[PDB]
PDB file of C-alpha atoms and ligand atoms in Angstrom:
ATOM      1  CA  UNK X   1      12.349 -21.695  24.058  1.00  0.00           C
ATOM      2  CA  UNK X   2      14.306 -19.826  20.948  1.00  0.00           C
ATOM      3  CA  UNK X   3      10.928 -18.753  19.617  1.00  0.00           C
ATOM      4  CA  UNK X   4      10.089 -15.665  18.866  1.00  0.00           C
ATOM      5  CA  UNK X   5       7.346 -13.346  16.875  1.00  0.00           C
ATOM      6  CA  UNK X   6       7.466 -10.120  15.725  1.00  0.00           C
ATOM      7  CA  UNK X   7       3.986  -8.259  14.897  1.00  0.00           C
ATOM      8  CA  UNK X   8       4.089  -5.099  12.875  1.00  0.00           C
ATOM      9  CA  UNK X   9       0.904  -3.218  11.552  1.00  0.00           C
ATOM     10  CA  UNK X  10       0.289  -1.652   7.943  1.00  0.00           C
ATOM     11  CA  UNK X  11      -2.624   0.663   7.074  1.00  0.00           C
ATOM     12  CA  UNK X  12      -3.904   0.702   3.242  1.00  0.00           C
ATOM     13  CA  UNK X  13      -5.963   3.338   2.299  1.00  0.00           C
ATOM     14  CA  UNK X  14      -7.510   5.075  -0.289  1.00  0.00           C
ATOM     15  CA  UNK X  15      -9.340   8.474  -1.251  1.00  0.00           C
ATOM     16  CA  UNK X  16     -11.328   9.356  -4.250  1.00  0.00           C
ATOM     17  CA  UNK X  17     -13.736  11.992  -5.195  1.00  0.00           C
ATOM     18  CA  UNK X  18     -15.588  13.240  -7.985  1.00  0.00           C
ATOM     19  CA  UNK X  19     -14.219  16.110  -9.743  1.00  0.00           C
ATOM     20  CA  UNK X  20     -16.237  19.239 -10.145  1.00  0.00           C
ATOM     21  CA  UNK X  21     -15.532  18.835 -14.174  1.00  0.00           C
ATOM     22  CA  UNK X  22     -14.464  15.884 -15.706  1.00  0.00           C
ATOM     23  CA  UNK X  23     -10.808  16.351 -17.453  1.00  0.00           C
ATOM     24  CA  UNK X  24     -10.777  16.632 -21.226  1.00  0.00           C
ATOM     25  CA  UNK X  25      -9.824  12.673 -21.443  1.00  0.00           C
ATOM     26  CA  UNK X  26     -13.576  12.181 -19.742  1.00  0.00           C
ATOM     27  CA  UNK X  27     -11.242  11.639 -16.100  1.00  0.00           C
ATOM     28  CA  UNK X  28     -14.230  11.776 -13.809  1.00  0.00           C
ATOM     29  CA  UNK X  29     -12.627  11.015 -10.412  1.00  0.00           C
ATOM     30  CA  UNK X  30      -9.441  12.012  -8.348  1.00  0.00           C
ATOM     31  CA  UNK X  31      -8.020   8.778  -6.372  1.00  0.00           C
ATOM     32  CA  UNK X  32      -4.910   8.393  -4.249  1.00  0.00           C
ATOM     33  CA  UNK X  33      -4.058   4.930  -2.948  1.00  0.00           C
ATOM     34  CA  UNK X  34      -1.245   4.509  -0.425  1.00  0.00           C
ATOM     35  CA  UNK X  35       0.285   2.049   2.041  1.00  0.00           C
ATOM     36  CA  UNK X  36       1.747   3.803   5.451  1.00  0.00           C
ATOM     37  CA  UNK X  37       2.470   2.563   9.559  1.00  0.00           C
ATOM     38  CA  UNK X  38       0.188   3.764  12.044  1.00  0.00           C
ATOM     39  CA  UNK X  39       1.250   7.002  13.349  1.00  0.00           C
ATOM     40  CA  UNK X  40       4.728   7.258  14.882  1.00  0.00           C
ATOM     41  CA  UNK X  41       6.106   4.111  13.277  1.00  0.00           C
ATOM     42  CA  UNK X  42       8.654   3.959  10.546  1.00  0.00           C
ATOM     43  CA  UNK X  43       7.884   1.083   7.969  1.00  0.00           C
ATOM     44  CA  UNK X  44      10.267   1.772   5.604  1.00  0.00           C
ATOM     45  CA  UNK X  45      13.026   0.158   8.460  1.00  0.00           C
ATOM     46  CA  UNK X  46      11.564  -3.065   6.663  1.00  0.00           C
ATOM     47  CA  UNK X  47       9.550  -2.256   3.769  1.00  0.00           C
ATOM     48  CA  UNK X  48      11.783  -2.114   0.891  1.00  0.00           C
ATOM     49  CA  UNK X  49       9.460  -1.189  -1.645  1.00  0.00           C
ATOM     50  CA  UNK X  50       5.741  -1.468  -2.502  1.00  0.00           C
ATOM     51  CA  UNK X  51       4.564  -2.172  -6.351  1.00  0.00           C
ATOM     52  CA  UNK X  52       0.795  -0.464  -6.967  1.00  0.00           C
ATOM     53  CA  UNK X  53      -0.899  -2.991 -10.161  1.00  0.00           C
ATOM     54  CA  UNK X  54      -3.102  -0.378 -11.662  1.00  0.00           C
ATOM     55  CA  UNK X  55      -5.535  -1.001 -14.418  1.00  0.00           C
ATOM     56  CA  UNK X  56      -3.714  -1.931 -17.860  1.00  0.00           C
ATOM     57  CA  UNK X  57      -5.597   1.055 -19.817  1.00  0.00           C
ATOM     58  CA  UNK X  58      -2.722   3.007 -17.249  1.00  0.00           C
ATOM     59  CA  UNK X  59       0.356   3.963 -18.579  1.00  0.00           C
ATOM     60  CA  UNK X  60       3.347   2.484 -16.106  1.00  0.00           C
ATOM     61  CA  UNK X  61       0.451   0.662 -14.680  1.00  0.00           C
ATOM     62  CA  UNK X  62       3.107  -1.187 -12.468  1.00  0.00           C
ATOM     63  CA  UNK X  63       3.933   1.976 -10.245  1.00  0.00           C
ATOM     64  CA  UNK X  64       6.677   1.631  -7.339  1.00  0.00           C
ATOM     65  CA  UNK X  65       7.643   3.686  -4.323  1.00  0.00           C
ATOM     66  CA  UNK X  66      10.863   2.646  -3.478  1.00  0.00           C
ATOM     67  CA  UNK X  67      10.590   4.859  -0.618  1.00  0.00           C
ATOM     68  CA  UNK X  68       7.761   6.824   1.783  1.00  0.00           C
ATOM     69  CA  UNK X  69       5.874   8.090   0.386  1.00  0.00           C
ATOM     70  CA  UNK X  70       3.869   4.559  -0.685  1.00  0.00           C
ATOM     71  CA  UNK X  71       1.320   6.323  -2.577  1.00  0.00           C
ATOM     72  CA  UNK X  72       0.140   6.905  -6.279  1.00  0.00           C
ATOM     73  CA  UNK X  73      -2.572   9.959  -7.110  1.00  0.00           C
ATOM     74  CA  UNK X  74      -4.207   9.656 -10.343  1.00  0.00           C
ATOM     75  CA  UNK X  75      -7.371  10.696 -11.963  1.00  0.00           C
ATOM     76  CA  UNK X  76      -9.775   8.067 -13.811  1.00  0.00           C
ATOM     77  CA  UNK X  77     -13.528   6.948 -14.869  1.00  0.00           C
ATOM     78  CA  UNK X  78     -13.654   3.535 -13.283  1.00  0.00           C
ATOM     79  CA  UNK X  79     -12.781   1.637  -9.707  1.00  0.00           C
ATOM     80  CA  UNK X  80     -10.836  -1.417 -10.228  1.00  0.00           C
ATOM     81  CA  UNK X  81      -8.982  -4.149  -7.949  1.00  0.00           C
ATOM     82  CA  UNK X  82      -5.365  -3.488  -7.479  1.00  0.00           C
ATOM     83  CA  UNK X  83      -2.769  -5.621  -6.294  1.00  0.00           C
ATOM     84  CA  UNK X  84      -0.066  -3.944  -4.018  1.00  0.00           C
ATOM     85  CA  UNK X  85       2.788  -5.953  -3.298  1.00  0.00           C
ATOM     86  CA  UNK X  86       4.933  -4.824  -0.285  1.00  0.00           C
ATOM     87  CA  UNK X  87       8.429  -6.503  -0.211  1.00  0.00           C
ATOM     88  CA  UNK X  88      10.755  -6.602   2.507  1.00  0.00           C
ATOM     89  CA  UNK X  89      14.178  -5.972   3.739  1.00  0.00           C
ATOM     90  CA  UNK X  90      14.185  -9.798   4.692  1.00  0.00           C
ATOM     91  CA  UNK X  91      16.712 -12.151   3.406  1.00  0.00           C
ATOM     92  CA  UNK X  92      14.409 -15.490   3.635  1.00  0.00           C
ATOM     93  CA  UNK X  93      10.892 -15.811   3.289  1.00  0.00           C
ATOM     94  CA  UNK X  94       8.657 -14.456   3.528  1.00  0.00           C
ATOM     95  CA  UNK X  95      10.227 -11.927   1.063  1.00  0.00           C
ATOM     96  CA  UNK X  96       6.433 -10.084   0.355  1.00  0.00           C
ATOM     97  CA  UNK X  97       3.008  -9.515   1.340  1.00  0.00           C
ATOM     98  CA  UNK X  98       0.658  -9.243  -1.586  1.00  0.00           C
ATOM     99  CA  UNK X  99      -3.175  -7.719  -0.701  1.00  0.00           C
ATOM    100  CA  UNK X 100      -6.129  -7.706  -3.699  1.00  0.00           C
ATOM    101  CA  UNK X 101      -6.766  -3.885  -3.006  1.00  0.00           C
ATOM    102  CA  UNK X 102     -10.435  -2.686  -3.919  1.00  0.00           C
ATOM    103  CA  UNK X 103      -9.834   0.773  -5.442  1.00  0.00           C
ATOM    104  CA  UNK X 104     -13.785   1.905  -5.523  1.00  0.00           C
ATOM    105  CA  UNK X 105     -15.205   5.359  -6.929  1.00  0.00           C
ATOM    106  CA  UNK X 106     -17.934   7.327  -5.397  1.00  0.00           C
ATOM    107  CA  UNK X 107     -21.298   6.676  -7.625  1.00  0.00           C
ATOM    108  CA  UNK X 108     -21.923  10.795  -8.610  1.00  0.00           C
ATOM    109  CA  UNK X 109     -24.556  12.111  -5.783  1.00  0.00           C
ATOM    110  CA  UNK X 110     -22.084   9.783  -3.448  1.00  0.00           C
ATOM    111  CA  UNK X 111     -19.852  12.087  -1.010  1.00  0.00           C
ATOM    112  CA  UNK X 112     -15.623  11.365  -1.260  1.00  0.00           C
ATOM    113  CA  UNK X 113     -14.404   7.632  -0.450  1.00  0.00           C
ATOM    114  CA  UNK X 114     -11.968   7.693   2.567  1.00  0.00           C
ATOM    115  CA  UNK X 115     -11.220   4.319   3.299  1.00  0.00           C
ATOM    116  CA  UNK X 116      -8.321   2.361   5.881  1.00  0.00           C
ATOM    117  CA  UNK X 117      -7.723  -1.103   5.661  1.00  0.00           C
ATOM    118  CA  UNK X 118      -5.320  -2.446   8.745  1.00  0.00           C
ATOM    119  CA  UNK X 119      -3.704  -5.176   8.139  1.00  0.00           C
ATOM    120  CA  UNK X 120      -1.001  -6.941  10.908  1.00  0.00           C
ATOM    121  CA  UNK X 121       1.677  -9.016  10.118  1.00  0.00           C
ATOM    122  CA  UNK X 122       2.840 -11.785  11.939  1.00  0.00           C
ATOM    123  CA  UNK X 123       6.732 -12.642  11.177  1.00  0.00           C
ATOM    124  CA  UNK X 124       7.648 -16.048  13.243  1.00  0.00           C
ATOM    125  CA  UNK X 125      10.939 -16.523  13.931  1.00  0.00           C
ATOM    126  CA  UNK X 126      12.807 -13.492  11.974  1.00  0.00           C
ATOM    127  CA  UNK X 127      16.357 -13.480  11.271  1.00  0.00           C
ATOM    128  CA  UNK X 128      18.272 -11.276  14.121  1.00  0.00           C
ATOM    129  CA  UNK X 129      18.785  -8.536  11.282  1.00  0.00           C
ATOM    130  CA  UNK X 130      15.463  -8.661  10.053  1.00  0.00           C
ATOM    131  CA  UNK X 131      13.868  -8.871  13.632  1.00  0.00           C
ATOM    132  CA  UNK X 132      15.937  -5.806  14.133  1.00  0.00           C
ATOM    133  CA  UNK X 133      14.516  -3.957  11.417  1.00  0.00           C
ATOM    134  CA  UNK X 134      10.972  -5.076  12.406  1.00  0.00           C
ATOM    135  CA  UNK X 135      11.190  -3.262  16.199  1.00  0.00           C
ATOM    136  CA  UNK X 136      12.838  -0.246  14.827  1.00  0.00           C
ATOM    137  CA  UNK X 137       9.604   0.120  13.002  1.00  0.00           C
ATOM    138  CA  UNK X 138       7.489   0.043  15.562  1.00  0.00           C
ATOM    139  CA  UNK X 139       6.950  -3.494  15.673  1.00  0.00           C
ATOM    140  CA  UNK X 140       6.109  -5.536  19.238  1.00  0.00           C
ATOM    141  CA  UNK X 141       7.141  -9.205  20.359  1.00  0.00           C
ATOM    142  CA  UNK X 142       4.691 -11.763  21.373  1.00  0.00           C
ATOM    143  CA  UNK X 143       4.281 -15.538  22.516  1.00  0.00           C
TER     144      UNK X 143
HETATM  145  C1  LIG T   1      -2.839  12.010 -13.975  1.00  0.00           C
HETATM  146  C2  LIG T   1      -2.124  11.186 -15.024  1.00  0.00           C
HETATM  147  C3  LIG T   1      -0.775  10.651 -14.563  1.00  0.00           C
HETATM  148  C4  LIG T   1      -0.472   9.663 -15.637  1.00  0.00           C
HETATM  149  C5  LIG T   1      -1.840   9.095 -16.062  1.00  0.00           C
HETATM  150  N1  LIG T   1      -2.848   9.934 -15.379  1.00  0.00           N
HETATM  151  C6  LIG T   1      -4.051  10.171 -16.191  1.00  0.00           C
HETATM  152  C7  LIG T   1      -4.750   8.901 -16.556  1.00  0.00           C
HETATM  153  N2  LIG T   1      -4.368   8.144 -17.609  1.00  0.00           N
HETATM  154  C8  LIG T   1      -5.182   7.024 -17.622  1.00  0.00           C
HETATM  155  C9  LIG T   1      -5.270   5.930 -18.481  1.00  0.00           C
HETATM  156  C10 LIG T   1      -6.218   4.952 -18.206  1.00  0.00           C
HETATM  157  C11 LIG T   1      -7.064   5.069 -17.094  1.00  0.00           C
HETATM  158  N3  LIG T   1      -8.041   4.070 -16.878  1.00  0.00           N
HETATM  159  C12 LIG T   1      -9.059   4.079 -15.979  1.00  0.00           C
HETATM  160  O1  LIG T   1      -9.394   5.076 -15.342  1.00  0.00           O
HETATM  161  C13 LIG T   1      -9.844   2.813 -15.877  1.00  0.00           C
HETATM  162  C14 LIG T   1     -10.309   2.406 -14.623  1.00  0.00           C
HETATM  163  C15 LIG T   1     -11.053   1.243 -14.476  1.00  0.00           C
HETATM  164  C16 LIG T   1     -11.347   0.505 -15.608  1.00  0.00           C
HETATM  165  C17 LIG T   1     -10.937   0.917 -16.884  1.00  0.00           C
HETATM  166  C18 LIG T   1     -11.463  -0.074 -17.758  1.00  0.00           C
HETATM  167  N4  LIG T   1     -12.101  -1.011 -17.090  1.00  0.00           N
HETATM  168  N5  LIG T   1     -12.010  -0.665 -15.773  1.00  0.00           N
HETATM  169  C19 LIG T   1     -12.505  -1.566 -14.747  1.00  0.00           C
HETATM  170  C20 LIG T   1     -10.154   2.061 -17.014  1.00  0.00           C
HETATM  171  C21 LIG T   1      -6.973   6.182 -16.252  1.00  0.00           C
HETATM  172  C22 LIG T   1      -6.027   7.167 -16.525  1.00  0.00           C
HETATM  173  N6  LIG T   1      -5.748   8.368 -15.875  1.00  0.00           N
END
């Protein structure tokens, strides 16, 4: 009767390709890893950050974008799994989404990686600030 959900949609992604040369440190492969809204959406009305785990051979391996754009570049020799946390403007739970992110390399021969992963979010029952937050972003009601 009072009840109320709030979908919203996030797109992780990631790019990598085999450089030309490898760098003097034996850097074989360009990546970029990011987290983004579909087009015309605003995430960051309830995103408040988003944490990238890289590898611990990385230095800063805990990387945050406090703001859009969610992304880190780097160059490296191996794929790993990375967990990206995405925390939210909300003042109750859930506070933060975290995803096991499979950060894979092109195998040399391979052509570049360009890979999406969509992922929707079901909030039930939001707060009426965080609900608010939610639909400026481009999120929908349901139920
Ligand atoms: C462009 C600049 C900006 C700051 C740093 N970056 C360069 C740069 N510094 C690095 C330090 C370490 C690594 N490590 C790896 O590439 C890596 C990946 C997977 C691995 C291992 C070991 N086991 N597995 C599964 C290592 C990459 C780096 N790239």
């Amino acid at each position: 009767d009072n009840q109320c959900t709030v979908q919203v949609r996030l797109e992780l992604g990631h790019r990598a390709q085999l450089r030309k040369k490898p760098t003097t440190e034996g850097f074989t492969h360009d990546w970029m890893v990011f987290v983004r809204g579909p087009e015309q959406c605003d995430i960051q009305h309830f995103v408040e950050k988003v944490v990238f785990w890289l590898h611990d051979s990385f230095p800063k391996p805990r990387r945050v974008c406090k703001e859009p754009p969610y992304k880190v570049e780097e160059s490296g020799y191996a794929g790993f799994i990375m967990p990206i946390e995405v925390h939210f403007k909300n003042k109750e739970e859930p506070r933060k989404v975290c995803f096991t992110y499979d950060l894979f390399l092109n195998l040399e021969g391979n052509p570049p990686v360009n890979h999406l992963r969509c992922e929707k979010l079901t909030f039930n029952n939001p707060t009426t600030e965080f609900r608010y937050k939610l639909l400026r972003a481009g999120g929908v009601m349901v139920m």
